[PDB]
Design a protein around this ligand. Structure first.
Ligand SMILES: Nc1ncnc2c1ncn2[C@@H]1O[C@H](COP(=O)(O)OP(=O)(O)O)[C@@H](O)[C@H]1O
Ligand SMILES: [Zn+2]
Lengths: 51, 70, 94, 191, 287, 277, 48, 204, 146, 35
């Protein structure tokens, strides 16, 4: 039962968290920075995370 | 306490949802969708949506703000 | 006067009431029904009348005392069965 | 002089009396108008309210510094019913208690021309209680003087206690002019 | 007149806060205010309220100082803040009426034609709603008795907009019960219903005893209503009803029996799976 | 004397209900209002009640404060018996998460200049959907301290934290310009009871009988679905055994609903039939 | 800017055609003279 | 909070003469007073294994609405059970895998207090997975409890102390680590090295 | 002040009784709910709808779109000519009036006879013997939608 | 009552002022219906 409840709570938290855009990598310019174009709006240089 | 959890699930699976197209299954309980608003998102699949019935380029309904494939 | 338990009325007892032979108690009950005072039905095959309504009227203190006694009995029964049910289901009541 | 006042106006049937030209109703209306004008002109920061004494007492204007609204509201008062002076004075006392400004003197002016039907014992007890709550009652008598003179004197004496000149009684059996009498009354002389 | 009135949780909490405020700042027997809502047919919806200064004598029971100027000022202010709300009644937090309530309702009827009085019991009961709705109707009693201006009960209910409803749910999440029928909760609900019925019968019985002994007068409408109750009592000793009841009980119990059979079969299958898994695990651990 | 990360705003139930009502009573407008309450000592903001403000037309800004209205209602409520100062201000951000814009920062700066312990409360009526009340409380940071490098808010206790700051606020300056405050609710027992009264079920509802025709129809629907699920369950178990779940779960749900509904109605029927005679 | 709606003497009420976004109406303010500001050429609208 | 802890301290050693005050506090509506009641139960039945107190603490730990009270109840349970250190893990293990992070933190601290200066094996085993949790304060409590349990334990006696010392060093030396987790690790190192490896922690 | 505009859309599928798939024109497509006072039966695919801005609920239906061509074609049609203004062609009036009017007004004649009502007629002739006028007269007499 | 009516003229005027925050939008009036 505890596993069931924990799974449901994690699912609730993640769903209540918003979504995420999808982008195509134009070029991996510089370390920790990635130039990515996201449809439809302009192309941004993103500060890539650690993972 | 396990009750109220099914309740919150059925409540997040509400009426004013937005239709979209499920493009690909990136991984378990997560996938890429394209909202009919005209933009693509990488959202989280709710549980119990018959992954077998969730075929590529299918018509899905997403939470209006979380865009989750409810 | 007749309670709902045995509210069935008979042509013969109506005749023993206000003086009329049992060939027009039907018409009397019909007039009551039409003017809209009592409600129910008439089964003249067995010569009885079923009532399920009576135009309420102002009453007397003795009548109210009898009604109070009846409600005493009803409330006692209600309390008894409440105690029974709560005692029986004590281990699931939230 | 910082002050919060309540004009208690009687509107019983006896105000139909035509002795005061044109009628007692307009006579007392002009009386309240003039007294309110004088009191407001004296330290405008004072505030004024209006109580009507009818079969069931009523309040038409809570403590306010404006006299125009008070006069406009009073203009519609009509003669009707009978006076209930005890309820009127108690309502006035409650309103003074509720007055927003606590730095004021608790005064109540009452045009009480009528035969007041109240017990003497409770009458004097209420007068003494009002003295305890530090009330200044001004009483305008025009009407059944022969009936209410002793009771109004009891009011004044009990409220004054010793040297308590704050409470006043002015009686005008004749009807030359109510406004003239009130302006030439000792209550308004100090104002 | 108005047939129904529905109060809002916002009104309830405002009233409770007003009473607690007055009590904290000084002991008092009542607190009074105005009720703003909207009209949709004869179903009033009290969507808001606000206090007004008020005090009265407990002995004479005829002297009080409701502040009509305060009332009109704050009504205008609330009109400015939100438009679609108008004076529909007044509330007081008194467990009992008083000889003044009629006079204060007379005062309020100037502001509203169909002014509704609402008695709100801050003290929490356990059976019914905490709000009672009354309306003053005076007419020539067709009963031929002397006519005296008095109130009349009005059907009351508690209802909330979506906003207040989400708010109250978030506040109550700690003790909120499951929004679904669970067997234990349903049994408890039947027990509570029996509690309520017993209490209502006891109250009616106490009134009947009072009338019979003579401490009160006799209300013809009350006697008529209790006559209708006793006359509407059903008969459960009739054969043509006993047979139908037995039939329905048997149907329900066949459904229950099939359900229990399926549940037992599933439990046995689970136990078989557990036995197989345990034996496999022990064999693997040994080898 | 630096504020520590233990200060907490105790929003009354009345305050929260009024705020959310006003937000949904004027969405999509940026509704505004004051928050009457009393700072207790240094770590509490006890928001007794909130204060609706007329729609000023110019969105939300200091120009919408309407000082005459504010002061006159302050005095008038004080007369009513509610003597509290103006602790902070609330204003909605419909749909656009919870955070402060430039005008919001300016207004909060004015409030802090008036008294440097007030708060800025943000409520989102659209995203405060059933079961979620997305509200936030904020206060500004001082540029001198930020440049000096000393942390904007002291941390003497494990409280204050325990909350995951929203990425929206992080982007809009959840720490560069301002900082969030924990929100507690002062749920009195009496208020909790009076709220319960909302969906509290009357004894009529408790002791009533569900319609028998609809009851039989529902029983048939569920029993037939259970039959189909039983067929599928057999197929699954047989294939599993031969080779060496969802049908079982659905079967359990259906059996549970059948049992509970049937037993409830039967017991209610007996209670009624031997209570009403 | 597309038009000045005759400037209505006072209260000019200019019309703007923010590209690919929308068309709006504006008072502008903060400039010297409602007429010497602009007639039909590029302009910088404030954000909110 | 101060009054709660103070009342609990006052009613120390009184095994059974306090039951009236425990009942009153536990019935009270204030969550801080319920927490005071849990602390009072612990101090009253300190080092007694009194099963009435254990039952009350446990029922509060799974029934009450205030997560602070739940955590305090679990810690008080540890206080009750320290006298038989091997016995507590059998209880607090089931809580340790709880959905309520406050309950998890309470389980961590209860295990730490119970098996302080004992070097128990299953206690450390339970703490480890908790030492790897997504929540912050649960990790903090797990680290501190492990420090309490392993204070003055050589690798030979407890073949996990080296692993936990390396874990403490790692968790301290990190970029993205949560502040509370780092704080717990630092205090854990301090406790494990307390007294220059000459002082242990024992409640008896 | 206390009114706010809705969102014009068109239903696409009557989903579960409360769920309606509505496509907001020049925008996305939602699944929305229907408010209390509405005719779900009236709501059919292709019907216009006024959704709410915030909650996206079907506030009320709206009649099907009107093409600009059909609007100019129908809503602007001045026809007012009595049969007396068609001097000749009394017989052709008989046949036309019969076929057009009589099935419209008093179809029970056709029902009693057993024949199904007619639909249309050709009305062909040399360039100007009078056809537009002959149709205008019947349109005016029936005062129906021409 | 005319003074109160003038005050209501004032409240109407301020309502117009607040609701006429000039930065409007421009839109076609395509279609036109009524119930
Ligand atoms: N029988 C008739 N009576 C009166 N006018 C006629 C008759 N026949 C033709 N006309 C005239 O001839 C014109 C024919 O116009 P129209 O009907 O538009 O073209 P068409 O004759 O090809 O149908 C009309 O304006 C009408 O006045
Ligand atoms: Zn803002």
């Amino acid at each position: 039962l505890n596993a069931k409840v924990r799974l449901l709570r994690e699912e609730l938290q993640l769903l209540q968290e918003q979504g995420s855009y999808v982008g195509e990598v134009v070029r991996a310019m510089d370390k920790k920075k990635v130039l990515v174009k996201v449809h439809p709006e302009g192309k941004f240089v993103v500060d890539v995370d650690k993972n | 306490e396990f009750l109220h959890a099914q309740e919150e699930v059925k409540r997040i699976q509400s009426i004013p949802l937005v239709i979209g197209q499920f493009l690909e299954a990136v991984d378990q309980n997560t996938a890429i969708v394209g909202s009919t608003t005209g933009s693509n998102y990488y959202v989280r699949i709710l549980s119990t949506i018959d992954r077998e019935l969730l075929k590529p380029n299918a018509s899905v309904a997403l939470h209006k703000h979380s865009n989750a494939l409810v | 006067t007749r309670p709902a338990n045995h509210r069935q009325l008979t042509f013969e007892e109506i005749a023993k009431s206000a003086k009329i032979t049992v060939n027009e108690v039907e018409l009397l009950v019909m007039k009551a029904l039409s003017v809209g005072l009592v409600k129910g039905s008439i089964d003249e095959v067995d010569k009885r009348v079923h009532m399920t309504w009576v135009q309420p009227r102002v009453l007397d203190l003795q009548q109210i005392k009898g009604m109070k006694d009846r409600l005493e009995f009803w409330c006692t029964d209600v309390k008894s069965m409440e105690m029974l049910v709560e005692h029986q289901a004590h281990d699931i009541l939230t | 002089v910082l002050e919060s006042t309540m004009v208690c106006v009687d509107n019983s049937e006896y105000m139909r009396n035509g002795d005061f030209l044109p009628t007692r109703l307009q006579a007392q209306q002009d009386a309240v108008n003039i007294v309110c004008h004088s009191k407001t002109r004296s330290n405008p920061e004072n505030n004024v309210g209006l109580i009507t004494l009818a079969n069931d007492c009523e309040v038409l204007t809570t403590l306010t510094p404006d006299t125009g609204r008070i006069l406009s509201k009073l203009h519609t008062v009509q003669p009707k019913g009978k006076i209930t002076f005890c309820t009127g004075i108690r309502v006035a006392h409650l309103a003074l208690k509720h007055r927003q400004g606590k730095n004021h003197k608790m005064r109540i002016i009452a045009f009480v021309g009528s035969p007041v039907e109240d017990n003497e014992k409770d009458l004097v007890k209420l007068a003494k209680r009002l003295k305890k709550e530090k009330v200044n009652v001004d009483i305008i008598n025009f009407g059944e003087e022969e009936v209410n003179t002793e009771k109004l004197t009891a009011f004044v004496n009990t409220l004054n206690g010793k040297d308590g000149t704050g409470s006043h009684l002015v009686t005008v059996p004749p009807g030359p002019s109510l406004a003239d009498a009130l302006i030439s009354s000792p209550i308004l002389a100090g104002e | 007149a108005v047939q129904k009135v529905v109060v809002h949780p916002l009104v309830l909490l405002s009233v409770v806060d007003h009473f607690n405020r007055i009590g904290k700042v000084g002991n008092q027997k009542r607190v009074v205010g105005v009720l703003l809502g909207s009209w949709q047919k004869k179903v009033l919806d009290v969507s808001n309220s606000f206090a007004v200064p008020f005090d009265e004598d407990d002995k004479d029971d005829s002297v009080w100082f409701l502040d009509h100027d305060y009332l009109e000022n704050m009504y205008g202010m609330f009109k400015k803040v939100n438009a679609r709300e108008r004076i529909v009644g007044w509330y007081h937090t008194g467990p009992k009426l008083h000889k003044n309530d009629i006079a204060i309702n007379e005062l309020m009827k100037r502001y509203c034609p169909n002014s509704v009085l609402v008695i709100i019991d801050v003290k929490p009961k356990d059976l019914g709603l905490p709000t009672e709705a009354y309306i003053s109707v005076e007419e020539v009693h067709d009963d031929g008795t002397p006519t005296s201006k008095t109130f009349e009960h009005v059907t009351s209910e508690i209802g909330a907009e979506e906003a207040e409803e989400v708010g109250v749910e978030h506040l109550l999440r700690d003790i909120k019960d499951t929004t679904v029928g669970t067997l234990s909760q349903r049994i408890t609900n039947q027990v509570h219903g029996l509690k309520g019925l017993n209490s209502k019968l006891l109250d009616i019985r106490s009134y009947l005893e009072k009338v019979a002994t003579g401490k009160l007068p006799i209300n013809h409408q009350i006697i008529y209503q209790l006559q209708d109750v006793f006359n509407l009592l059903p008969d459960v000793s009739l054969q043509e009803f006993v047979k139908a009841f037995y039939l329905k009980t048997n149907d329900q119990m066949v459904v229950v029996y099939l359900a229990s059979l399926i549940r037992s079969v599933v439990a046995l299958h689970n136990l078989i799976n557990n036995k197989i898994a345990n034996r496999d695990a022990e064999k693997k651990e040994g080898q | 004397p630096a504020v520590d990360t233990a200060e907490q705003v105790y929003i009354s139930s009345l305050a929260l209900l009024k705020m959310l009502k006003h937000g949904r009573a004027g969405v999509p407008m940026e509704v505004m209002g004051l928050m009457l309450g009393e700072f207790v000592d240094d770590y509490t903001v006890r928001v007794i009640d909130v204060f609706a403000m007329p729609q000023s037309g110019t969105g939300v800004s200091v120009e919408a404060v309407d000082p005459v209205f504010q002061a006159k209602m302050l005095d008038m409520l004080k007369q009513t018996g509610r003597p509290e100062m103006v602790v902070g201000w609330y204003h909605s951000h419909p749909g656009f998460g919870c955070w402060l814009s430039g005008v919001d920062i300016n207004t909060q700066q004015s409030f802090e200049a008036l008294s440097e312990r007030a708060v800025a409360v943000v409520v989102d009526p659209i995203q405060s959907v059933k079961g979620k009340v997305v509200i936030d409380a904020f206060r500004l940071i001082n540029a001198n301290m930020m440049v000096l490098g000393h942390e904007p808010r002291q941390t003497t206790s494990n409280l204050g934290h325990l909350n995951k700051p929203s990425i929206q606020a992080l982007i809009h300056g959840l720490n560069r310009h301002y900082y969030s405050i924990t929100i507690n609710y002062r749920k009195n027992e009496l208020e909790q009871k009076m709220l319960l009264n909302l969906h509290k079920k009357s004894w009529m509802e408790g002791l009533t009988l569900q319609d028998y025709s609809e009851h039989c129809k529902h029983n048939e629907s569920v029993v037939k679905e259970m039959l189909e699920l039983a067929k599928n369950y057999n197929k699954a178990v047989e294939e599993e055994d031969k080779m060496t779940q969802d049908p079982k779960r659905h079967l359990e749900e259906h059996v549970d609903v059948l049992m509970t509904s049937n037993i409830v109605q039967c017991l209610a029927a007996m209670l009624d039939t031997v209570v009403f005679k | 800017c597309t038009k000045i709606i005759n400037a209505d003497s006072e209260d000019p009420k200019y019309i703007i055609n923010v590209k690919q976004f929308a068309k709006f109406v504006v008072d502008l303010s903060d400039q010297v003279a409602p007429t010497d500001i602009e007639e039909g050429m590029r302009v910088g609208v404030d954000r909110n | 909070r101060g009054l709660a802890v103070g009342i609990a301290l006052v009613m120390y050693g009184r095994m059974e003469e306090a039951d009236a005050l425990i009942e009153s506090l536990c019935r009270d509506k204030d969550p801080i007073l319920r927490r005071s009641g849990m602390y009072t139960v612990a101090m009253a039945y300190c080092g007694s294994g009194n099963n009435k107190a254990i039952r009350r603490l446990l029922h509060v730990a799974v029934s009450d609405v205030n997560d602070d009270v739940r955590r305090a109840a679990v810690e008080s349970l540890g206080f009750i059970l320290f006298r038989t250190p091997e016995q507590c893990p059998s209880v607090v293990s089931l809580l340790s895998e709880s959905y309520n992070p406050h309950v998890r933190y309470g389980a961590a601290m209860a295990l730490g207090i119970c098996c302080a200066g004992t070097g128990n094996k299953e206690a450390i085993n339970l703490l480890e997975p908790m030492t790897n949790d997504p929540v912050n304060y649960v990790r903090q409590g797990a680290l501190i409890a492990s420090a309490l349990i392993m204070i003055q334990q050589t690798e030979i006696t407890c073949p996990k102390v080296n692993q936990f010392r390396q874990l403490y060093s790692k968790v301290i030396n990190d970029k993205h680590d949560d502040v509370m987790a780092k704080f717990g690790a630092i205090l854990a190192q301090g406790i494990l090295d307390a007294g220059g490896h000459n002082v242990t922690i024992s409640l008896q | 002040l206390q009114s706010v505009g809705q969102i014009v859309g068109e239903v696409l599928k009557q989903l579960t009784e409360e769920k309606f798939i509505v496509k907001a024109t020049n925008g996305p497509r939602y699944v929305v709910g229907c408010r209390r006072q509405l005719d779900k039966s009236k709501l059919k695919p292709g019907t216009r709808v006024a959704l709410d801005m915030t909650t996206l609920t079907i506030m009320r239906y709206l009649p099907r779109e009107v093409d600009p061509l059909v609007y100019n074609m129908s809503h602007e049609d001045p026809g007012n000519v009595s049969y007396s203004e068609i001097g000749g062609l009394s017989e052709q009036i008989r046949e036309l009036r019969e076929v057009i009017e009589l099935p419209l007004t008093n179809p029970e004649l056709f029902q009693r006879v057993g024949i199904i009502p007619p639909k249309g007629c050709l009305l062909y002739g040399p360039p100007g013997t009078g056809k537009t006028l002959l149709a205008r007269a019947v349109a005016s007499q029936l005062d129906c939608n021409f | 009552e005319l003074q109160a009516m003038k005050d209501k003229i004032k409240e109407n005027s301020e309502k117009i002022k607040v609701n006429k925050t000039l930065p409007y939008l421009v839109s076609n009036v395509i279609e036109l219906l009524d119930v």
